[model samples]
Structure formats: structure tokens, C-alpha cells
Target: GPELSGWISEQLMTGRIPVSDIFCVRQRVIPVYQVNNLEEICQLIIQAFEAGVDFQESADSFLLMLCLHHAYQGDYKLFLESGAVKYLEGHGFRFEVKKRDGVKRLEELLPAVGKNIKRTLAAMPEEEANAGQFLSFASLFLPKLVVGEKACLEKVQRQIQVHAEQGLIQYPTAWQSVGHMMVIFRLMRTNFLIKFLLIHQGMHMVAGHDANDAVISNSVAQARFSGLLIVKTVLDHILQKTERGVRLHPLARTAKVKNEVNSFKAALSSLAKHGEYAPFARLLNLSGVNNLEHGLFPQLSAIALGVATAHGSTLAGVNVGEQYQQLREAATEAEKQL
Candidate 1:
């Protein structure tokens, strides 16, 4: 409302807006957008909670925010004194924090003992307590990944890109190398989150913190972040061998996938009898295909020709239509009347 807006500006002329006005115009608290420094980040997070919008992201920011605040050795009872607790713990922390499963997922990018530890974990009192505690414990960092996620891939690519500049991956456009980079990146992220969970909680594992000390939590967290960076080092090495393959085969893998998929679709259409001259028809129409090669004629022919070479010689091209016209001329032919 302009009426509200103008009255707010009148207060602005006086160099202060009432807390009531701040609450009223919570939607326009632009500090939510720009500012650096740890203390300022804490201030904006509280401001965000007071507004109660974008609640999940606010919690995500807080996990690292609190741990680092601890890491920095500065104390602010601000969390307890402000509405921050009311919004974060008051509504439901469980609603904001999340977790993922490890059924078939533990591919050993962690300690390489991920699954074994999970099993002995199954054999292991306090473990269930830890699992549940770790659920919220794990939950905090998982949500925090949303915060990490913004820079995660950009950071991953930056490292990979440096390798490209250094001549480790000579083909920047090669996708197998590009493709595996993502698989490995996901591993590193999961590694970071779990390390965050254990070490932040690790203060306890190490005989634990200030009852809930940030000092210990922050120490472990910094170590995890650095260690996680190192974990990424080994993971990318797997890409190096296949990395160069992308140079010689820029996108031949993707090309074959498209060709084979079209080949299968055409074969299916033929079995339904709708494919009489259909391949040639598509070649002529272009048929909404992105380009000439994507049409059925080339794709089906690609499959057909592969079938020929694999058999080591051309198969006879049976003249079925002409045979049907003169079946009675050949005594050996099966009787059509039967």
C-alpha cells in the first residue's frame, strides 16, 4: 500500500523504522539479498525467520552459520534472545531437514567402508539413538547441502576446468569425461554431508562439546571441508583415462544412443504393419525431426547395415513381392489355397 509505503518513508527520513514497521514491511527487507561477513549473515537469518518465508533455506544457512560462528569463537546469545528459535525450532525442524537412503547407493567413494560400517551399524544401542539423533543431525547438514549446492557444481567444474587448462583433459567437449565428472561430483557432495554429520556431531564421538560446544563442532567441520576437497582429488583420477576418449569421440556415444532408439521404434512400428514405406516417408517429410540423420531411414538403415557386417557377408535380398505374383510357376511353392 502506498499509504503504508509513504508512512514508512517518513520514518526513514527520521533515520529509524519502528520494529513494528520492520515486521510490517518484512517483505521488503532487502538486506536479505546482499551483505557479507559472518555476523551480518546471522543478522539476516534472524530477520528471515522473523518474516517466516523461505523457511527451509533459512534453516539450511543456519547449520553452517552456527557451526562457523562457533568456529570463530564469537558468542551471541542472539539465537536464544531473538525470534530465531521460535521460527526454527517452534514450527518443526523435521519439516525442514531431510535425508536420503543407501540401499544400492554406497559405491564406496567415502571411506570405501560405507556399506560395511552400515552393516556393523546394524549389529551395533546408542546406534539407533544415533540414527535418530543423526537423523536430525544428518538432517541439518543435508539441508545445508542446499546451501552448499549453489556453489557445488560451479566449484566442481572449476576444478575440472583447471585440469582442462592444464592439459589433463584435452577435449573439453568430450562427454564421457564430462559425464563421469557428474557421477563423481555427486559422490563428493554426499561425502561432505556425511562428514559434516559425523564431525559436527563428532565432537560427541570425540567425547563431545560445551555440552553442545560450537568450538569442537567448528574444528571438526573445517577439517571435513578440507578433507572433502581432498576426496574429490582421487575421484576425478578415474575420469582421466576415459577423459581423452572424448577427444576422438566428441559425442559418438550419444549418437549411437539416438540411432539405436530410432531403430527400435521403427522395428516396433513395422511389427504393427504401419511401417510400409514409413522410413522413406519420414526421410521425405523430415517429420518434426531435429535434422536429417534423426529421421527413421538413416537410423533403421544404420541398424540394418550393422546386422549385415556382423554376419560377415550380405544376406540374400529376397524378392517377396515378385514371388507372390507367380507362386504357381514354381512347383515347390506352398499352395495359397491351403
Candidate 2:
């Protein structure tokens, strides 16, 4: 509730905040053994906590300033803080809070409508065709977000250093957890892009892009990268709110990572179905090929059979911890072979 309230205030202050405006810091402070005197230790702990608060407060203020500036294109730029200014320069985009909020709200509302959309979609005879339509439509906004990912990641790297140092004053546990989190965040981000590219453009298309289209795919790859960047950025703010606990915290970072992984799996499954359906659906709608019964239809049938077998095998191996990595790597290897 405090965060929501803080978010409201920050939004009001910033004229228009871009999705890229957030940053997370992972600080680690290493103290000399002699400096670990009780007074020194207590002083450092207080300083670390204060530093975390300062960053969080600054982030909120930064958001507010961006929102306010975006309200009137007049060089309200006078209020630009260090973080927001850096973010704008790196992304080549100004904060427009209205546009950002519209997209955020739309994304938020999708889940409520998702089930209904799916049921209506299932009624369509051409399932793959309908699915592709949705995927293509959704992809229109993918470019800006993707391209911004790199700059966002740069901010995250900086924040990791800042936050990790701050944690150093508190305890080794905080420093270690934050460090591991940064690593996991990086891996999850990279893996998300690989999954996204594979799903939208078949592995064949993604793996063998023409030189002309390389830049285009790179843009999509960035969108995948941005997701992790934003997660870490938001979590930096979140970790400051609560005290350390033995149990894992369920906040924006963890939620985003888990949801991203789940969405990737769903996207892959849909694409796989589309890949399987393309040939049969095309064959069913064909006209002049009289020998259809003995032609590519047989090959399509055999492929479909194999896909079904593989699906069963996948289900049987769902408990395997490395299944996702193994499958992704296997796909990569198969693509290289192709």
C-alpha cells in the first residue's frame, strides 16, 4: 500500500515516466577486520540502511519529475535527476507518463479478459491462424521496449554495485543474496529473449535470419532483455521497504521472473502447435492437387505423429529441473544442424 501510494505520488511528480525509468541497486560493503569495531559496525549498518532509503526516495522523486515534465513538453527538463536524465539519454526517448500508463493499464487488464478471449478463440476452426493473429498484433509494441533493454541493463549493473555495497554494512547474507539475485536476473533475461525469438519466428527463421533482418530481430531480442532489466530495477526499490527475512521474499522481482518463465513456456507451446498445424491446415484447404492423399500430407501426418510423441515425452519429464534448459539447448543444436 505504501508503494502504491508512493507510486501515485511519483507518477504525479513525473510528467511522464518511461518504463525504462526504474533502476535497482545491489550493494555490498566489505569492511576491514580492524574496522569491524562494534561502533564502526553499527555506524556502517545505519549508513547502509540510509543509503538504501536515499536511493529509493530518489527513484520515486525521479519518477515524479519525469511524470510532471511529460505533462507539458515545456523544458520542465530543469527537474531532471541523475538517474532519469541518464535513462532518457541512453534510450533516446523522453518520458511520456500518459503513454506509459496507458500501456501498463492495458497489460494489467489483459489477464481479466484472457479466458474469455481464449474461449472465443477456441471456437475458431483455424486455431493456429487465430493464434498467429494475436501474436502478431501483440508484437507491434515489442520494438521500443526491446531496444531500451540494453540501456536499462547498464543501469542494473550500476545498481548492483551500489546495492551490494550497501548490503555489506548489514550482513554477508544480504550481500550474497543480492549477488545471486543479480546473476539469476541476468540469466533469466537472456533466456527469455532466446525463448521469445524462437516462439514468434520459428527456430529455423530466428536461427537463419538474413543480414537485412538481423537488426530487426535484435530489436525483439532487446524487448526480452528489458523485462529482466525492469524487474531488477523495480526490486531495488522493493528490497528497501522490508527488513531481511529467512524466507524468500515474494515481491516484484520474484513475480516477474516466474511470470516471464511461465509466459515463455506458453508462447513456445502455442508456436509448436502452430508449426504442427500449418501443413495440415494448408493441405485441407488445397484445390488442384489430385494426388494429395499420397503427397506432402503423408509427411505432415508423420511429423504430427512425432510431435505428439514428443509432447508426451515432455509431459512425462516435467519434473526434471533442467528440462527447460535442455529443451532450449536441444532446439539450438537442432537449428545449427538445419
Candidate 3:
């Protein structure tokens, strides 16, 4: 017993076998040592079956070993009654009991279950065989792309959606849904946007995810506040830089710039509460920054401002920006009628 335990520990330490294999083996063997009678052994077998111990090849082999050992010991009655026989049969094992010398005994059925188990194991692929597995693999490495430009993420999302619609992408488990996969994508995008904003503000990068719409809205609000603070600081710096120069005419009160800055701030406040991207985009236009071609400011604002809006709308299963625009158009029509 000590030698076997030491060997198992060594294999685990050296990564020779998976820990799950050891767990299945222990599940099958440990109970037999603790039990005092055949009834307990039968109960253990039934419990193992109900606990879904045969989801893998090694687990199935371990259970089969226990059954064959019991049958060989002339405890065929308990082994047959343990439910392990029925379980194995359901998994493609065939069994027969017949009267020989006026006594009923388990026929030579070990080879049948053993052969079925080997075939099942042989048929299992060693690597990914479908789209679901591909998506899972992509999810692990693709989350890092959030730190890149927004266009990159948008391109990837479009591709993923197209493939999914075509039934090209599959889920790893029956319980996981397409909505869950989309949430993962949205959460990564939002996390990147927040991290980008923090870095621009000379703050440490903090990573987070949207557990729900409320949480995402709050995060967006915080980002907006931080962006406004940075904007004010930059404006103050600009003012100080120009104050050192003597001018014949006071700096002309540029109504355009003032209006733009004010409107942008107002847009942030509105977006923080309403989660509408189009309204924020319109406000950016009013602020005269919508056509910003190449600058960190444009990129940062685009991502930070729209991240929460996109994520929340996706969570709610509605394009809130489109809905808001439609409502605005309807109100305009009502005003015309009045």
C-alpha cells in the first residue's frame, strides 16, 4: 500500500499522469478498504455509477476491474445486483447469466465490457475536433487583443459573429450558450478600454469585467469622470502655456471651442446614465472633435466612451443607441405636428 501510494505521488509530481486519473482510481479503490462486507462493496459500486465515475476511459476501467474482481471471487450475486453491470451494459457491454450444473453464474462477460471500453477510448480525439473547441482556444489568447486599437477588436468580432451564424463555431459544453461567448468578447473589449483610459491618465492599468449592466454602467461613469479630470488638467496647462505671452488683443473668446468642450462633458454625463453611444457621438461632433483623424485623444475617447454603451446594449439584447435615435426622430415629428 505504501509503495503504491508513493508511486502515485511520484507520477503526479513528475506530471506523468493527470490528477483526475488518480482521483478516479482512488474513488474506486479507497472505499473497498474501508468497507467490512459485500453489501458495502455493492453500495460503493452503485454510488460510483450514480456519481458519474465513468465519464472517462480510466474511470471506466477502474470500475470494470472492481466488478470483475468481485465476480471472480464467487460474489457474482452482489456484483450483478450492484447496478454496475447495468451501467456497463448501457455503455455497450453485453452480459449473460445461465444455469450450468443446476446453478446460475455470470457467463464470460469481462471481455465484452473490456473490448467496448477500449473501442470507446480509441475513438476519442487527442485534440480539438470542432468549432466550439476552436472558440475556447481563441478565448484564452484573444482577450489580450483588447489592449490594441478598437478597429482590431471590431474586425475580430465581425468574423466571429459571421462564423457563428453559419454554424461554424461550436460550444464546448451543452450548458454554455452563444450569449455567454458574446459576453466574453464584450467584457474583454470593455476591460481594454478601461485599461487604456487609466494608462492615458498616468494611472496603473486595472483589469475588470462586466458581471451585469449595472456594474458596466458604474465603470463607464468612473471612466468618464477620470477623462473629464484629464481634459480639465490639459486645458489648464494650455491656458498657462499661453498666459506667458503678451498680446495686443486678449485671446479671442472662441465660442466654438468652448461650446465643444462643454457639449463633450455633457455627453459624458448623459452617456454615463443612459448608455447611448450615438448621442455621445453626436455630442463629440458638436464639440468639433468628431473628425479627429490621428491622435491619442480620438482613439482614447472613442473606446472609453463607447465601451459601456456597447457592452450594456449587448447584455440587454437591444441596440440602445439605435432605439434612442428612433425615439428622438419620433419626438421631432411630434414637434413638427404641434
Models 1 onward score TM values of 0.17, 0.16, 0.18
Cα lDDT of candidate 2 equals: 0.28
Q: Per-residue lDDT of 1-338 in model 2, one digit per residue for the tens? A: 01212342123122233222332223222111111132323232223222232222222222232223222122333424334344333433333322112221112212222344334323433211121211222222243323344553454344335434754211133323444334323332333222232223421243332321332233344343222222222222222223432111132234424444343323323322333222211211222222222121222222222222333322111121342444334433332332
Tell me the tens digit of each residue's lDDT in model 3 across 203-314: 2213233112222233233333221233322222112112443111111123423444344444334333322222222212223333321222332222222322322321
lDDT of every model, 2 decimals? 0.29, 0.28, 0.31
Candidate 1 vs candidate 2: the TM-score winner is: 1
Q: Give the Å shift of residue 209 in candidate 1.
A: 6.2
Task: Report the error of model 1 at residue 327, Å.
Answer: 68
Candidate that scores best on TM-score: 3
Runs in model 2 lying further than 4 Å from the true structure: 1-141, 145-199, 202-206, 225-229, 236-338
Each candidate: RMSD to true structure?
Answer: 26.1, 27.1, 25.4
Q: List the residue pairs that clash in candidate 3.
A: 132-170, 260-287
